[PDB]
Design a protein around this ligand. Sequence first.
Ligand SMILES: OC[C@H]1O[C@@H](O)[C@H](O)[C@@H](O)[C@@H]1O
Ligand SMILES: [Ca+2]
Length: 307
Amino acid sequence: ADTRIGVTIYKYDDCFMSVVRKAIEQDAKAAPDVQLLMNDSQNDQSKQNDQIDVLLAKGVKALAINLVDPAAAGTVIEKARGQNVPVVFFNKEPSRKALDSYDKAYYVGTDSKESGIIQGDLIAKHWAANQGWDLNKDGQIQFVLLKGEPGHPDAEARTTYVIKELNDKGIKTEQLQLDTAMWDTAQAKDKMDAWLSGPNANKIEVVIANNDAMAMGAVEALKAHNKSSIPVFGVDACPEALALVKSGALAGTVLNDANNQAKATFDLAKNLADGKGAADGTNWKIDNKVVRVPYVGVDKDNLAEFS
Ligand SMILES: OC[C@H]1O[C@@H](O)[C@H](O)[C@@H](O)[C@@H]1O
Ligand SMILES: [Ca+2]
């Protein structure tokens, strides 16, 4: 009969996870034997926990879980273990210890630091090509940074590695501001607006955001202050962001490959639901229960390949 797979998305109103959610539903449409039970956890781990209980009570044969809280992986694993059901975590990466605590736990995502390195290289390229961006002519990038959720592996790695990569390439940096905007456009717009309204706003040379949603908020705040001359960099290559790379409102971004992350999540979940090896009949390379999908930098010079 039909194989039910339970899926939780941490919040449907996340740009990137909306792409992933839709892609996984398209993938399921192409598997006549599988029924997806899709849940919006509304950015609340307690809601997600209850949703998982309901899915397990409905007899799902696998779970695909996009955690609200990464630290809740253990909690979720113990729920799955109660039914001896496999779980494919995706996009918010559990700790190695959590993954190793249950032989039926897997993870699909990315090499988080790669996105930071790529973003840093993009900034380095554009900085070298636009020395007018060095407003105070000190040879250093005076930056502000809009961080994702504290503790989220992508937020932590993108924040560390964008700056490390710039510095390693011989570009000194001065952090003027850094705060979280929780992956959200409105929070980022308000934070950027505050920074532009504070004393020494005039020192800001480059805006770095851990994702496109926050970058797009910054773009709007810059526009409101007639400061669009300041470049903004993001991560994801969300559809709206690519339009802004085209228009010049966004200086660069980094494709976070939602389509392939969705496909790997679905393929592994379906195999595990069927009691097969996770990668059976696929080309996915699973390394110690993890699949990582490459990022790719995007700017006007290669936009034609992504538009
Ligand atoms: O967990 C959700 C987050 O995942 C990250 O990989 C994406 O870059 C963000 O846009 C998204 O908000
Ligand atoms: Ca400078």
